[PDB]
Amino acid sequence: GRTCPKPDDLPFSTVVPLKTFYEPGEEITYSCKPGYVSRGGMRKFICPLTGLWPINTLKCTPRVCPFAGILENGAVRYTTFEYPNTISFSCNTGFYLNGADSAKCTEEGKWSPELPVCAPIICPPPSIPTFATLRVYKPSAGNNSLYRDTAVFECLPQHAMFGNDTITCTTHGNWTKLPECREVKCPFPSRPDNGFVNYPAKPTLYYKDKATFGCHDGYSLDGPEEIECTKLGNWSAMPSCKASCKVPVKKATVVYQGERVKIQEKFKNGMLHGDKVSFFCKNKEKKCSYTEDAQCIDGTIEVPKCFKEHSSLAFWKTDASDVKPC
Ligand SMILES: *[C@@H]1O[C@H](CO)[C@@H](O[C@@H]2O[C@H](CO)[C@@H](O[C@@H]3O[C@H](CO[C@H]4O[C@H](CO)[C@@H](O)[C@H](O)[C@@H]4O[C@@H]4O[C@H](CO)[C@@H](O)[C@H](O)[C@H]4NC(C)=O)[C@@H](O)[C@H](O[C@H]4O[C@H](CO)[C@@H](O)[C@H](O)[C@@H]4O[C@@H]4O[C@H](CO)[C@@H](O[C@@H]5O[C@H](CO)[C@@H](O)[C@H](O)[C@@H]5O)[C@H](O)[C@H]4NC(C)=O)[C@@H]3O)[C@H](O)[C@H]2NC(C)=O)[C@H](O)[C@H]1NC(C)=O
Ligand SMILES: *[C@@H]1O[C@H](CO)[C@@H](O[C@@H]2O[C@H](CO)[C@@H](O[C@@H]3O[C@H](CO[C@H]4O[C@H](CO)[C@@H](O)[C@H](O)[C@@H]4O[C@@H]4O[C@H](CO)[C@@H](O)[C@H](O)[C@H]4NC(C)=O)[C@@H](O)[C@H](O[C@H]4O[C@H](CO)[C@@H](O)[C@H](O)[C@@H]4O[C@@H]4O[C@H](CO)[C@@H](O[C@H]5O[C@H](CO)[C@@H](O)[C@H](O)[C@@H]5O)[C@H](O)[C@H]4NC(C)=O)[C@@H]3O)[C@H](O)[C@H]2NC(C)=O)[C@H](O)[C@H]1NC(C)=O
Ligand SMILES: *[C@@H]1O[C@H](CO)[C@@H](O[C@@H]2O[C@H](CO)[C@@H](O[C@@H]3O[C@H](CO[C@@H]4O[C@H](CO)[C@@H](O)[C@H](O)[C@@H]4O[C@@H]4O[C@H](CO)[C@@H](O)[C@H](O)[C@H]4NC(C)=O)[C@@H](O)[C@H](O)[C@@H]3O)[C@H](O)[C@H]2NC(C)=O)[C@H](O)[C@H]1NC(C)=O
Numbered sequence: 232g233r234t235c236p237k238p239d240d241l242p243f244s245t246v247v248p249l250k251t252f253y254e255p256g257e258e259i260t261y262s263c264k265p266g267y268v269s270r271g272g273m274r275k276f277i278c279p280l281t282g283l284w285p286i287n288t289l290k291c292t293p294r295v296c297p298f299a300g301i302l303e304n305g306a307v308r309y310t311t312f313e314y315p316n317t318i319s320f321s322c323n324t325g326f327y328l329n330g331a332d333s334a335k336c337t338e339e340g341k342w343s344p345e346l347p348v349c350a351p352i353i354c355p356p357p358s359i360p361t362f363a364t365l366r367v368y369k370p371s372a373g374n375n376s377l378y379r380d381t382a383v384f385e386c387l388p389q390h391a392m393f394g395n396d397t398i399t400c401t402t403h404g405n406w407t408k409l410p411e412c413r414e415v416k417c418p419f420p421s422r423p424d425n426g427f428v429n430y431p432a433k434p435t436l437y438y439k440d441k442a443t444f445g446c447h448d449g450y451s452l453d454g455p456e457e458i459e460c461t462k463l464g465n466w467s468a469m470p471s472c473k474a475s476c477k478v479p480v481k482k483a484t485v486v487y488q489g490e491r492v493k494i495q496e497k498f499k500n501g502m503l504h505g506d507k508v509s510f511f512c513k514n515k516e517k518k519c520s521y522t523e524d525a526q527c528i529d530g531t532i533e534v535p536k537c538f539k540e541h542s543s544l545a546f547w548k549t550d551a552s553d554v555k556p557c
């Protein structure tokens with residue numbers, strides 16, 4: 232007699248019982264696979280005497296989970312919302328994901344886990360360190376702060392801040408490192424030889440107290456006029472009063488700070504300690520002029536050997552300063 236052959240394999244379906252041939256009268260059942268549905272549901276068929284399976288209209292399609300394309304204050308990555316697809320979640324800047332960062336459309340057509348929600352990152356009010364005060368703080372969310380809000384500490388008078396005055400509200404709802412404020416003391420600064428020092432009239436000097444230095448005529452400071460008590464207990468500097476130099480020649484054109492000057496004119500009131508200058512010398516061979524340097528150090532300046540004075544107009548090809556350069 233005729234038999235029906237092995238039934239067609241339709242997409243996303245199973246057939247029960249599955250055999251390679253059937254006697255007329257035997258029943259098969261097509262079902263959608265878990266996670267699929269079809270217009271009509273299960274199709275049952277009985278092998279007819281002709282041995283021909285009739286037409287099967289079963290169309291098995293994925294279950295569709297509910298629309299999950301919008302995360303308030305964030306983003307969803309998805310292709311479609313159908314079984315068995317995963318969707319991914321993330322939050323805009325300043326929000327955190329309250330829930331799982333992914334979810335799956337299950338064979339039952341619901342999301343697992345449940346869809347998350349985005350919420351504002353918040354820090355509680357910050358603690359004030361000891362001997363610190365709070366300059367810049369205003370809450371931006373009820374009484375709490377929002378992500379990347381800042382607070383600024385300043386120390387009490389006579390206290391140095393170790394660390395940094397500005398804290399930020401982090402992603403972890405806690406603030407960045409607090410700074411410490413300790414009291415710091417400096418010794419009295421030493422009066423320099425050939426000068427004086429002024430600092431405030433009181434028995435101890437603290438962080439940020441200023442001392443100013445002066446020199447007697449004929450001396451200048453070899454460092455800054457004003458110094459301050461630093462966070463490490465020492466002073467910003469300790470300058471000396473150093474001796475000025477007499478102009479070492481009666482008349483000469485020199486280079487000072489990259490320009491030609493008359494040394495008698497530019498330094499009519501002496502040369503300060505530090506003042507550097509270049510004297511002009513003649514190369515007799517190549518009939519041209521070169522410079523050698525000289526510096527005022529604590530009342531002494533060494534004019535180069537090559538320099539020849541009584542410079543008006545005399546020596547062949549005139550003053551070294553007026554001769555063509557080498
Ligand atoms: C706000 O709120 C937040 C929420 O919690 C807080 O955030 C936390 O920050 C703290 C740290 O302050 C975190 O805890 C700590 O985690 C440290 C890092 O762990 C990583 O490395 C571990 C190595 O064993 C490993 O177990 C982890 O897997 C982890 O690794 C990584 O994985 C990520 C991916 O997920 C990768 O991207 C990373 O690249 C990868 N990194 C690594 C290294 O693999 C941890 O070190 C720290 O331990 C200290 O404190 C413990 C206190 O009980 C103590 O038991 C530990 O021993 C340790 O201490 C020190 O010991 C270590 C050695 O174990 C010393 O280090 C070495 O010295 C060797 C010399 O012999 C040298 O050879 C080595 O090279 C090395 O230098 C170290 O010197 C010791 N230090 C001291 C002082 O003794 C701790 O467990 C916490 O997990 C964070 N949580 C969160 C949610 O963020 C935040 O703190 C809050 N903020 C404020 C301001 O309060
Ligand atoms: C910045 O952030 C800070 C910190 O959070 C914040 O400061 C907070 O500010 C709020 C308000 O300014 C303070 O709190 C609450 O104030 C209560 C006083 O008033 C009420 O009455 C007025 C009347 O005009 C009404 O208008 C108010 O709305 C309010 O009453 C309401 O009453 C109706 C009745 O019709 C209810 O329908 C409402 O639910 C109720 N509303 C509210 C909001 O409560 C004060 O009494 C409360 O105190 C509570 O909660 C405290 C939590 O810390 C707790 O310490 C207290 O002890 C007290 O809790 C009491 O708990 C008892 C048990 O432990 C309970 O016992 C009896 O009741 C039940 C019976 O069923 C049983 O438990 C028991 O058998 C017994 O009979 C008490 O009932 C219960 N008391 C109350 C009143 O419920 C609230 O504090 C905050 O205190 C304050 N927080 C801090 C830390 O300062 C600030 O506002 C923020 N800044 C900004 C700008 O936002
Ligand atoms: C205590 O420690 C703190 C933590 O380390 C210190 O804070 C840090 O300060 C430094 C410098 O002050 C910050 O870094 C620098 O950032 C520069 C990048 O700046 C940007 O410029 C881009 C243009 O090319 C913009 O597209 C960016 O938006 C950004 O912005 C602007 O910056 C302007 C000032 O320059 C400002 O006027 C604008 O309003 C602002 N605009 C915007 C949108 O931001 C780099 O060029 C530098 O090389 C360097 O990286 C550093 O970021 C900051 N720490 C953190 C976590 O942000 C703090 O200084 C210290 N306190 C003390 C007293 O030392």
Ligand SMILES: *[C@@H]1O[C@H](CO)[C@@H](O[C@@H]2O[C@H](CO)[C@@H](O[C@H]3O[C@H](CO[C@H]4O[C@H](CO)[C@@H](O)[C@H](O)[C@@H]4O)[C@@H](O)[C@H](O[C@@H]4O[C@H](CO)[C@@H](O)[C@H](O)[C@@H]4O)[C@@H]3O)[C@H](O)[C@H]2NC(C)=O)[C@H](O)[C@H]1NC(C)=O
Pocket residue numbers: 463465466467468
């Ligand atoms: C006011 O206060 C303090 C004194 O209380 C002064 O601080 C001192 O300043 C010096 C330099 O400014 C610092 O010490 C050393 O710093 C550098 C770099 O140090 C780094 O590199 C070393 C490797 O050499 C390594 O350990 C670390 O990575 C470190 O960060 C060094 O090059 C140098 O180190 C040596 O100093 C020795 C003298 O003590 C010599 O024998 C060595 O040959 C070499 O020069 C340098 O000394 C410190 O910060 C600090 N020192 C101490 C002891 O406290 C501060 O300068 C002063 N200011 C004023 C204005 O008076």
